[PDB]
Curated annotation (Swiss-Prot):
Component of the BRF-1 ISWI chromatin remodeling complex, at least composed of SMARCA1 and BAZ2B, which regulates the spacing of histone octamers on the DNA template to facilitate access to DNA. Within the BRF-1 ISWI chromatin remodeling complex interacts with SMARCA1; the interaction is direct. Component of the BRF-5 ISWI chromatin remodeling complex, at least composed of SMARCA5/SNF2H and BAZ2B, which regulates the spacing of histone octamers on the DNA template to facilitate access to DNA. Belongs to the WAL family. It comes from Homo sapiens. Expressed at varying levels in several tissues, whereas a smaller transcript was expressed specifically in testis. It comes from the Eukaryota. The gene is BAZ2B. Regulatory subunit of the ATP-dependent BRF-1 and BRF-5 ISWI chromatin remodeling complexes, which form ordered nucleosome arrays on chromatin and facilitate access to DNA during DNA-templated processes such as DNA replication, transcription, and repair. Both complexes regulate the spacing of nucleosomes along the chromatin and have the ability to slide mononucleosomes to the center of a DNA template. The BRF-1 ISWI chromatin remodeling complex has a lower ATP hydrolysis rate than the BRF-5 ISWI chromatin remodeling complex. This is Bromodomain adjacent to zinc finger domain protein 2B. The lineage of its organism: Eukaryota, Metazoa, Chordata, Craniata, Vertebrata. Residues 9-113 form the Bromo domain. It is found in: Nucleus.
Length: 115
């Protein structure tokens, strides 16, 4: 509360570390469904159904341009990529499987880097 704070966590490396995680997600062999925005002209139903599209290239641009106020807002956009994927793709599809795999991969890196 006012004049009452928990001890200050060092957040000075968060930006660099989120960048490294994102690089690792970019270079995973199962990243291909997520590298670029879904083409809303060419994929029927996506525009209407997925209210907040997100992809790794868009996260990269937001990250590089100071549009994440903190590491939690960065995690929210990564998870949004996978939540979108589950909303639109059957579990038993290459893309559905890719999203589960990448979510797992992300969550482990996130815990190991920050928790």
């Amino acid at each position: 509360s006012m004049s009452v704070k928990k001890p200050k966590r060092d957040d000075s490396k968060d930006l660099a570390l989120c960048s490294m995680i994102l690089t690792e997600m970019e270079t995973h062999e199962d990243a291909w469904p997520f590298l670029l925005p879904v083409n809303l002209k060419l994929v029927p139903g996506y525009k209407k159904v997925i209210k907040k599209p997100m992809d790794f290239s868009t996260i990269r641009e937001k990250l590089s341009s100071g549009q994440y106020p903190n590491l939690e807002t960065f995690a929210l956009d990564v998870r949004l990529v996978f939540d979108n994927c589950e909303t639109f793709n059957e579990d038993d599809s290459d893309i559905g499987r890719a999203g589960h795999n990448m979510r797992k991969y992300f969550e482990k890196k996130w815990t190991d880097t920050f928790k």
